[PDB]
């Protein structure tokens, strides 16, 4: 705990050695024990300001971050003959309602008194679980539950063939054909494209699949009514033969241009009748037909902050897909500029997601080869919901005014989600539209109506309850630094597109200035409350991240993909990416979670992201969420080299090292235990590379040392000094 005030200039070692836990809302003990899991639903201010004026004085953003479809340990599934909802605002009865007459419950979002249906009511599972899934009746569906439909669209130009991506993708599909979510209704299709659009018919009556080339790029059509989207269960053998033949078909191809637009138009027409998931694999700039994009010159470290899409074709097309319940996932494996700032729109507005593999090559880039394999494994095997809508309700007086994430905002704040995936994160900014003088508690309820991979309409509901406060201090005491950092990153992304990168960077700095200056004017050095002791650190890390960094050699698509992750990833992986956890791992010992039966799992202390915390005599592991990087010092001990790395000297550590060996040494067992523990805490398998050697020209390990100064940014101490100059100006 800590009501205490912190002077950031004398501490400077503010980062705790143990992982950061989310704040506990200051609620009654029995209210809080029912509260939603903060990994699924959390607020920037756990103590809600009573008025809009109090919120403005605090200079902190009010918003929610949510991970509604996250994989869960246990999920209570209610199959009641009726779903009990509020008669006025349609809020699902939740643990935070108020029972009075025992046959009447008071809605916690609009205060309307309702009647309890003849169906100890407070023991009902709907009132005992903040997270619950409902079986939906016929009124909750516009059409019969759609089947699972997976359409794969591959670029087969000369550049794409040279990357060799098509081989591992077809191999992953073969390995994971039985793990695709669905039942006997599952449908699957395939399209390749270069300058023309190629369909593939699959009939058991024919000796081999049939490649149907649509060459009319200005007027695409579906060449065959049946057998393009085939039943996976029936035509399993036909799909497997195609996945084995596809990588061999375009070996000697001279097609250099790519008609991505018309191919997505054809893929859209093929999926229009049913909806489903479209997996697009693109490797270069689209230069032929509708959706063509002009080349651009990459910026260097010298150009200032002088972003947006070059066209609205992919945005319009994405909206057409959304109307037919089609989500589009984009896999960009480009070696040159491809205008991701325009291509990303196909996934933003269709509730898809983008995946970036810069300079992918089957021979030359083994790290991107293994990264694609691991991301595809998760992408093909994770659960999936189809034709999904999400609504989010909050207590009267609170109003959502800005949505963040991949979806399409329908009227009345309905979020259209053609697909919903368990790895997607969302953010919302709200304001106090009416003063909360009435209540002392406000609630927030997200509802996700979707069709499962088995053809069952389901509603997943999460309810969060927070208290209302009326003093500036109580607002600051309840601030969630990580949630505030996450919401600000989503706001700065929008600011980049709306204004410029300069304005985005300034508003991020101004949020720290305005927050602590307001705190100062309500109490020498730089004084912050305990809850905000990491606020300048995380914002500095935000400004050095690839999304907002300036004087770097960062390229256009890299920055856009970094912003696509801010808008689409859950909070925890935004924090892992922005401020990775750094550990020393050459001297591990068992003070660890040695409880797990037979495993010891060391728990080395988290280190501040600075080269000063490093050491040429040891080895350090950096958990950036999606990747683990093990830097080895030039003067590392012979024990670590031989017993962990399996190498006799620092000079013979292989240049790209894709993973540690599992040697028969206790030192190896300790480090494999610590790495395995890190990975079990997430589902996209993070590749570990120890290749970070003092000279592998791949030591971007140092780019995450966000506390150190560079030639084009401040240090953490310099940053603190600039904040204090502006706080008491």
């Amino acid at each position: 705990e800590g009501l205490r005030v912190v002077n950031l200039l004398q501490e400077r070692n503010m980062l705790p050695s143990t992982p950061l836990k989310p704040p506990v809302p200051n609620l009654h003990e029995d209210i809080q024990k029912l509260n939603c899991n903060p990994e699924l639903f959390r607020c920037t201010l756990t103590s809600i300001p009573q008025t809009q004026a109090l919120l403005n004085k605090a200079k902190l953003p009010l918003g929610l971050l949510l991970h509604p479809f996250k994989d869960l340990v246990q999920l209570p599934v209610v199959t009641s003959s009726t779903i009990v909802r509020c008669r006025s605002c349609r809020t699902y009865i939740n643990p935070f309602v108020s029972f009075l007459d025992q046959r009447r419950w008071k809605c916690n979002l609009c205060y309307r008194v309702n009647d309890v249906p003849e169906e100890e009511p407070h023991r009902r599972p709907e009132v005992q679980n903040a997270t619950i899934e409902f079986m939906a009746p016929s009124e909750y569906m516009l059409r019969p539950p759609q089947p699972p439909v997976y359409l794969f669209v591959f670029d087969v130009s000369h550049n794409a063939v040279e990357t060799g991506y098509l081989n591992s993708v077809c191999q992953s599909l073969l390995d994971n054909l039985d793990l695709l979510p669905g039942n006997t209704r599952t449908k699957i299709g395939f399209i390749t494209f270069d300058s023309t659009i190629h369909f593939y018919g699959l009939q058991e009556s024919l000796s081999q699949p049939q490649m149907l080339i649509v060459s009319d790029i200005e007027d695409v059509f579906i060449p065959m009514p049946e057998n393009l989207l085939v039943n996976l269960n029936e035509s399993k053998e036909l799909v497997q033969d195609l996945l084995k033949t596809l990588p061999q078909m375009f070996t000697k191809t001279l097609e250099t241009q790519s008609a991505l637009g018309p191919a997505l138009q054809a893929a859209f027409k093929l999926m229009s009748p049913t909806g489903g998931r479209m997996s697009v694999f693109q490797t270069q700039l689209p230069t032929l037909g509708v959706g063509a994009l002009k080349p651009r010159e990459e910026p260097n470290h010298r150009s200032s902050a002088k972003m947006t899409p070059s066209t609205d074709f992919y945005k319009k097309l994405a909206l057409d897909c959304s109307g037919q319940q089609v989500a589009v996932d984009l896999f960009l494996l480009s070696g040159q500029y491809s205008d991701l700032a325009s291509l990303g729109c196909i996934s933003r507005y269709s509730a898809g997601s983008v995946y970036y593999y810069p300079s992918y090559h089957h021979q030359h880039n083994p790290v991107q080869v293994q990264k694609l394999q691991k991301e595809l494994q998760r992408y093909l095997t994770r659960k999936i919901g189809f034709e999904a809508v999400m609504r989010i309700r909050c207590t009267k007086g609170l109003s959502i005014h800005t949505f963040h994430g991949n979806f399409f905002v329908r009227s009345t704040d309905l979020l259209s989600l053609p697909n919903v995936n368990p790895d997607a994160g969302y953010a919302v900014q709200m304001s106090v539209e009416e003063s909360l003088t009435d209540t002392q508690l406000v609630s927030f309820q997200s509802a996700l109506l979707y069709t499962s991979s088995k053809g069952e309409r389901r509603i997943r509901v999460h309810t969060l309850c927070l208290p209302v406060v009326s003093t500036l201090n109580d607002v600051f005491l309840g601030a969630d630094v990580q949630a505030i950092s996450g919401l600000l990153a989503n706001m700065a992304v929008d600011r980049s597109m709306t204004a410029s990168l300069s304005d985005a960077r300034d508003a991020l700095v101004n949020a720290v200035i305005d927050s602590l200056s307001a705190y100062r004017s309500s109490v020498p050095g730089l004084m912050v409350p305990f809850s905000l002791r990491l606020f300048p650190l995380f914002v500095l890390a935000l400004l050095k991240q690839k999304s907002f960094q300036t004087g770097t050699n960062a390229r256009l698509d890299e920055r856009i993909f970094a912003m696509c992750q801010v808008k689409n990833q859950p909070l925890v992986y935004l924090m892992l990416t922005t401020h990775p956890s750094l550990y020393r791992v050459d001297n591990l010992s068992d003070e660890g979670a040695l409880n797990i039966s037979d495993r010891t799992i060391p728990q080395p202390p988290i280190l501040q992201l600075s080269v000063e915390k490093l050491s040429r005599d040891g080895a350090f592991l950096m958990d950036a969420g999606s990747v683990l990087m093990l830097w080895v010092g030039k003067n590392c001990t012979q024990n670590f080299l031989s017993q962990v790395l399996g190498v006799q000297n620092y000079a013979s550590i292989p240049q790209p090292m894709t993973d540690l060996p599992e040697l028969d040494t206790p030192e190896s067992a300790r480090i494999i235990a610590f790495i395995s523990w890190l990975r079990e805490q997430r589902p996209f398998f993070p590749i570990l590379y120890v290749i970070a050697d003092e000279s592998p020209m791949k030591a971007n390990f140092l780019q995450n040392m966000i506390e150190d100064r560079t030639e084009s940014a401040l240090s953490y101490y310099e940053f603190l000094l600039h904040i204090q100059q502006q706080v008491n100006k």
Binding site: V389, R391, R410, T412
Partner: peptide
């Protein structure tokens, strides 16, 4: 688009 959710 309108929905019951």
């Amino acid at each position: 688009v309108t929905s019951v959710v």
